[PDB]
Design a protein around this ligand. Structure first.
Ligand SMILES: [Mg+2]
Ligand SMILES: [Mg+2]
Lengths: 47, 78, 136
RNA sequence: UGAGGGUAGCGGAGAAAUUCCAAUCGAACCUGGAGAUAGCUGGUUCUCUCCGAAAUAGCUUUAGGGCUAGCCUCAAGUGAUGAUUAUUGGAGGUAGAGCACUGUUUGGUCAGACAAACUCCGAAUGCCAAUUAAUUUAACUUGGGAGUCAGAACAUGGGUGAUAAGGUCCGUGUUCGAAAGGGAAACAGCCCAGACCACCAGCUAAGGUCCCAAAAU
RNA sequence: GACUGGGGCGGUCGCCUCCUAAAAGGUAACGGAGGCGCUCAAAGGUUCCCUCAGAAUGGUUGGAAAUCAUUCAUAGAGUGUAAAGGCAUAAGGGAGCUUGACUGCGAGACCUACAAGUCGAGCAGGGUCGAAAGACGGACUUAGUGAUCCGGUGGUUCCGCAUGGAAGGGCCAUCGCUCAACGGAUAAAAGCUACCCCGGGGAUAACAGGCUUAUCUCCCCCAAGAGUUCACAUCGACGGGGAGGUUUGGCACCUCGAUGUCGGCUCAUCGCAUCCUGGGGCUGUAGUCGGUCCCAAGGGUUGGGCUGUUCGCCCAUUAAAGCG
RNA sequence: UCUGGUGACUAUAGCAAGGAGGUCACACCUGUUCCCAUGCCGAACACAGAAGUUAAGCUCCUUAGCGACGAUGGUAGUCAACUUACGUUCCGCUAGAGUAGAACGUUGCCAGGC
């Protein structure tokens, strides 16, 4: 199954990205890091 | 009996938009293509989906370089 | 029954029949030939009938080379149907000739035997042919 | 079978046929809502002057209807940006031809052949340009008003059909549509040619010169 | 529901690539031939290096195509998934670090009725690989999708009906569709009419006219052979060429404010491709009878049973029981 | 000119058989003390370098067998015109593909040492 998810920053509580993952190849939550809007920095992101 | 056929894609207008010798501006689209039938030359930038366009504004030339390969250049002074 | 083993497409457009022959104008193997002078399709049943007619009068004392082959198939729909709603199945196979093209060649037989041996095959072919000997 | 009576329209009566209910009954008649509604038919009345189309695209509970775009018209505004050849540059793979590739194919690596979905090659024209010269007179912009969305033959490139139809579906050109006149015996589409009105003058086109019937037995 | 070589029945409806498409773009048919409604946390970014298919020879013979080495190769393999254009600049084949599968934008142009769709140098904010110049806002390229209204979820420096709060609305970010008849009538929908009724159309069918001649009816060329030998007395294989416009059809031009449809009675009339009679030519014609083919339309061409019959089959005749 | 670097005109430069040459250089070649290297291997990419040789590479020269290039002349098509219905003809432009002759064993730029 491929189900879209919606990332969220941790230090600031705000959804700011969308992705899609494969439920077989990655059963655990995705933990990339991307540019944020409030801090002008690059904190983490996690579903 | 029946037919299993018909059913075509419509069109994508896919050829030369500007012609050899005229003053093109800074972002004009110079060719639409699948693959690279005609290469980007100098002062010309190949875009994504291979649609090469101009960068600085000047005259255009379609010039040959190899055995079966071609390129498009744009030169500055008009 | 002359037909290709496999063709890449079974339903083709009809071939063009005006002008003059592309190539195959000269006798090149045998010694006497049969060149057509009018344009028509020939449909591979009228080559089974003009080959055997040449074979019997020669008493199988020479060789026969047919220099055409039906490549192109031609269609037809059954009787008492309305127009459109498809394109019919393959009926048979045609071959186009144009005025100049050698059809048949013979070798290994005399001239006055072969001249009365090619007349028995032009009356089973539609086109008006004549009797051409080799380039000298 | 006479006489007097009863059942009434979303209703009566029916030994049952959609049968009868004031010459009409798959749901009577009369005035009212009501000038119901109609993308469908017929009709629409005075005269001259100038310009003069379309029968195509896209979407539609759409296919004989509608809306925007295309083609005509009147007025304002920019003002050679419109057309035509001559020279010049360049994009592109048709006709033709050829098997180097993908498949087809006849006779002993050699000789020969075939191709809408094959190309080592490849015209004639067309198309886009220069801001270059020569002849001509259009062209874009903003606003007012409609029409048209059933097209037809002939010529010439091809599809479908049977190298069938005055067949049907697309590309380019002309005439009819909206066009009289001379010719084709008669005949919207073929060939010559575009009528401002008058004349009992003239020279010619397509086609014609014995006679009907103008002109050479 | 609509298209529909009348309607029904079957089929198909949107997006992608090729061909017909007539060497720029564009271009139709119930014309020819295939896919799509997804998948990848590495199959994406960057940096450094490598080049393939098969052929042939050899040996645990795993046919030399399991694996193994040498030559030859010019692109004949491969590129997530159809086909076209494209590339060993690699856009193909392996490793390490990695999140640009970024936030705010966007001069210009392609394309187009409108709504949308597509490419975009460059400027700032934060980053990543590389020594650096530099490259990177997804994948070799194009398909993998759906207006509005309405509701749900997280944020908000916006309003909040006397004032202070709140219930509510606003913008930014995302979610609910085989609305697949894919520009989507509504949150919600199948039939019968020969009991039928109004508005239209020869724009569109059934009968007849017309064009065409695949079918249908006759006619002919070549000649293998059947006929003791013998192609042509007679028959005419496999193949080729036409005429007629009676059959079954194809096209939808004339008539839907009427062209109203089969056979036999009554009465005709014309064609020659002749059933009878008249005149000939061959004959495998002894004689009687026949068979074929050519000239010939002047007259003639029966009476009944069975069927609504068209064909037809039978019974008794006759010079003959002609086809249109 | 003559050698090496380095971009251009890009098979008229190629591919293949022969033949000549080497302190000026490029190579061939010996090595693993280390940075560096194999998903197997100093073969390769690095790195150290008295010695060893023109054999292959590169460099020069000639032979045109193979690939590439290619006229003139004629034909096929075809824009325009005139009759025409014929698998058409005649006239005026343009001009192919194949084939013959032939050109052909590269023409040059810029810095560095002879
Ligand atoms: Mg814009
Ligand atoms: Mg737009």
């Amino acid at each position: 199954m491929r189900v879209n998810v919606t990332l969220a920053c941790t230090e600031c509580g705000d959804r700011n990205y969308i992705t899609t993952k494969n439920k077989r190849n990655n059963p655990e939550r995705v933990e990339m890091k991307k540019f944020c809007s409030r801090e002008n920095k690059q904190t983490l992101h996690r579903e | 009996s029946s037919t299993k056929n018909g059913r075509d894609s419509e069109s994508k207008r896919l050829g030369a938009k500007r012609a050899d010798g005229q003053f093109v501006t800074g972002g004009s689209i110079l060719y639409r293509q699948r693959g690279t039938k005609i290469y980007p030359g100098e002062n010309v930038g190949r875009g994504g989906d291979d649609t090469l366009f101009a960068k600085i504004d000047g005259v255009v030339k379609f010039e040959r370089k190899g055995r079966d390969k071609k390129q498009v250049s744009v030169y500055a002074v008009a | 029954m002359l037909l290709p083993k496999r063709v890449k497409y079974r339903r083709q457009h009809r071939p063009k029949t005006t002008g003059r022959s592309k190539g195959g104008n000269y006798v090149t193997f045998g010694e006497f030939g049969l060149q057509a002078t009018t344009t028509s399709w020939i449909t591979s049943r009228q080559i089974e009938s003009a080959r055997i007619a040449m074979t019997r009068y020669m008493k199988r004392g020479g060789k026969v080379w047919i220099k055409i082959f039906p490549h192109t198939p031609y269609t037809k729909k059954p009787l008492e149907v309305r127009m459109g709603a498809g394109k019919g199945a393959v009926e048979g196979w045609i071959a186009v000739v144009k005025p100049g093209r050698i059809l048949f060649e013979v070798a290994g037989v005399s001239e006055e035997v072969a001249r009365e041996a090619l007349r028995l095959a032009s009356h089973k072919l539609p086109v008006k042919t004549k009797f051409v000997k080799r380039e000298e």
